[PDB]
Amino acid sequence: MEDFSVSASGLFITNEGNFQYSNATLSYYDPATCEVENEVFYRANGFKLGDVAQSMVIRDGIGWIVVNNSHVIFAIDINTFKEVGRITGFTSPRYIHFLSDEKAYVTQIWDYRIFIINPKTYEITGYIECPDMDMESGSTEQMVQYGKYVYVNCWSYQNRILKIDTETDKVVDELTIGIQPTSLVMDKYNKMWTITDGGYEGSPYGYEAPSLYRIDAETFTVEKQFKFKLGDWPSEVQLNGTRDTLYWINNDIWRMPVEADRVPVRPFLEFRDTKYYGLTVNPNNGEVYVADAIDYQQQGIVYRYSPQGKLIDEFYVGIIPGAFCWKLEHH
Ligand SMILES: [Cl-]
């Protein structure tokens, strides 16, 4: 059990590990030293993280790690990585969205409810019931704020964006699109971007050419659609800090101005017969980090790029690195 006291500026990489093998880990990268530290939760705390670390959000000096398949969210101190508390009772958590110090939503797979939680007391306070959704095929996923509203994508065996009114904690609208929207971002024009994964071969629910969509938040309608190829399996819409440049995964890493009418012919980073899996854009300097799962078995690798596409650094992380979380000194 180990004493960490790290940089005020930093990058966390969550490593899902192998679903049903409890080898998920946390990585911490220092961009100023170009040094990675691996398995930092375990080293810091004396216990393992669990199964499928999904995502992670930092608020007010505290890091909130969603461990999807261990029914828990760890709160760690972000400088020491020691746990300050945890929340148990999630069916299968995905993403955490704070509305205040005392109120956050936590999405779930295999549940039709979004859990309301109190972060100060470390408790579950309620549930938002999703319409046309059961437990066996249920999915809520990533979330964005638009005023009093929260928008959420319904991922596994679903095909909807839902609108929640946060003042009443209830689902007030929905929009049906292509199957299995994977992720959700809000650009600086208050237009949402989601990209579907197209389902999978043999799926009971379906399997189709996936799409990238731009959806106006005010009118909750599709303004643009970029449709890809059967067998494509896109994911991970991400924005730059000014929220005017969008990246995602589709074999390659792709980059497009939010105002563009076409995807550029050339990608940001070319497919190299691996598995680009995670993605993030540094919100201050526009540097792009690409998490490569490679073969879903070996140690993953993160590549760091300049906004102009030139490789800066690369570093080994844990198994299937899927998500990132910025610890920034200045915003
Ligand atoms: Cl760890």
Residue numbers in the entry: 40 to 370
From the paper:
Contrasting with Enterobacteria, members of the dominant genus Bacteroides often encode several BtuB vitamin B12 outer membrane transporters together with a conserved array of surface-exposed B12-binding lipoproteins. Here we show that the BtuB transporters from Bacteroides thetaiotaomicron form stable, pedal bin-like complexes with surface-exposed BtuG lipoprotein lids, which bind B12 with high affinities. Closing of the BtuG lid following B12 capture causes destabilisation of the bound B12 by a conserved BtuB extracellular loop, causing translocation of the vitamin to BtuB and subsequent transport. We propose that TonB-dependent, lipoprotein-assisted small molecule uptake is a general feature of Bacteroides spp. that is important for the success of this genus in colonising the human gut.
Here we present X-ray crystal structures of B. theta BtuG2 complexed with cyanocobalamin (the manufactured and most stable form of B12, CNCbl), adenosylcobalamin (one of the biologically active forms of vitamin B12 with the bulkiest upper ligand, AdoCbl) as well as the precursor cobinamide (Cbi), which lacks the lower ligand and the nucleotide loop. The cavity that contains the cyano upper ligand is narrowed by Trp194, Trp272 and Tyr316 (numbering based on the annotated Uniprot sequence, including the signal peptide). To explore if this narrow pocket could accommodate a cobalamin with a bulky upper ligand, we obtained a structure to 2.3 Å resolution of BtuG2 co-crystallised with AdoCbl. In this structure the side chain of Trp272 has rotated, enlarging the cavity to fit the adenosyl group. The interaction is stabilised by stacking forces from Trp272 and a hydrogen bond between the hydroxyl group of Tyr335 and the nitrogen in position 3 of the pyrimidine ring of the adenosyl group. For both structures the hydrogen bonds interacting with the side chains of the corrin ring are identical. Thus, given that the lower ligand does not interact with the protein, the structures suggest that BtuG2 can bind many different, if not all, corrinoids.
